[PDB]
A paper describes a structure:
Crystals of ligand-free enzyme GdmF grew in rhombohedral form and diffracted to a resolution of 1.4 Å. Despite the low sequence identity of < 36%, the structural homology to prokaryotic and eukaryotic NATs is quite high for the refined GdmF structure with root mean square deviations (rmsd) of 1.5 Å for all backbone atoms compared to the structure of MlNAT1. As has been previously observed for prokaryotic NATs, and in contrast to eukaryotic NATs25, the C-terminal α/β-lid terminates in an α-helix positioned away from the deep active site cleft. The low crystallographic B-factors of the β-barrel and α/β-lid indicate fairly rigid domains with average values of 24 Å2. This leads to a two- to threefold increased active site cleft with a volume of approximately 700 Å3 in GdmF. Despite the high resolution of the crystallographic data, there is no apparent electron density found for a major part of the interdomain region (residues 194–206), suggesting a highly flexible, mostly unstructured loop. In NAT structures, the interdomain region has a largely α-helical structure and closes the deep active site cleft and the catalytic triad. This altered loop region in GdmF appears to be a unique feature of amide synthases and contributes significantly to the widened active site cleft. Given that the native seco-substrate of GdmF is much larger, the wider active site cleft and flexible interdomain region may play a critical role in substrate binding and/or catalysis during macrolactamization.
Amide synthases catalyze the formation of macrolactam rings from aniline-containing polyketide-derived seco-acids as found in the important class of ansamycin antibiotics. A key enzyme is the amide synthase ShGdmF (hereafter abbreviated as GdmF), which is not part of the PKS and is thought to catalyze the release of the ketide chain from the acyl carrier protein (ACP) domain of the last module 7 of the polyketide synthase. The overall folding of GdmF largely resembles the common architecture of its NAT analog, revealing a three-domain architecture with an N-terminal α-helical bundle (domain I, residues 1–88), a β-barrel (domain II, residues 89–185), and a C-terminal α/β-lid (domain III, residues 211–257), the latter being connected to domain II via an interdomain region (residues 186–210). The catalytic triad (Cys73-His111-Asp126 in GdmF) is highly conserved with an rmsd of 0.04 Å compared to the catalytic domain of MlNAT1 and is buried deep in the large active site cleft between domains II and III.
Numbering used by the authors: 0 to 193, 207 to 257
Amino acid sequence: HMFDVAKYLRRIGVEGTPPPTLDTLRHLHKRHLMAVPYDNSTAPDRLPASRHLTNVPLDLVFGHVVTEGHGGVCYELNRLFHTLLAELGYDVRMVAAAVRQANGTFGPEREHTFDLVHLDGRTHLVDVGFPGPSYSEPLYLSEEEQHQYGCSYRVTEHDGYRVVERRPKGSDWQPVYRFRPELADPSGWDAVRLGTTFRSRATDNGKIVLIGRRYFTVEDGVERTKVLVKADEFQDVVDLILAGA
């Protein structure tokens, strides 16, 4: 249906129309990640012949994710969330990032679409559309260490990029993705150009992530992983992710 703030807030379990503050932004971000899973399983079905994101109507994505209760990918979840935050009064700017790959390199420059919010003289990173282990509440755009639910984060500067880095318990710092902050754009969503399944969502104190058979959980910063074998256990994990919280 047409984009509707009240319907979206109900979908993510947020009461009323909370005020346009940092406390509200933190709550909206965490609730969105708990309620709306990342899921790329049908993302190809929604791609536009023309590869311009503006050719995918926002109401189509709103209907899939909000009305029908399904998950989506970065340029679906963060596109919707940008619109929600703008309607709630925040100064939101779209940004794109290159994702750290398993081999340690970074992928294509604008592969991962997310947002920044400038509020009360400070900038926060907002990302409700990233499959892997990452921040459940907004990060400050700062190299200073930030701590949430047992994990540490920092946003360092390297070679003209800002790099989001994460450190869980017992492990070293690892980059998540990198972006050029000066390319942020209030209207950037309008300019976006477009086999393994990725599904994930946040929990109260962490995140659960399924990439193919690879099941990752983090709880208060303590990570556990398991390569799932059994079909019933695999389906139970999919169901748990997609059910939201």
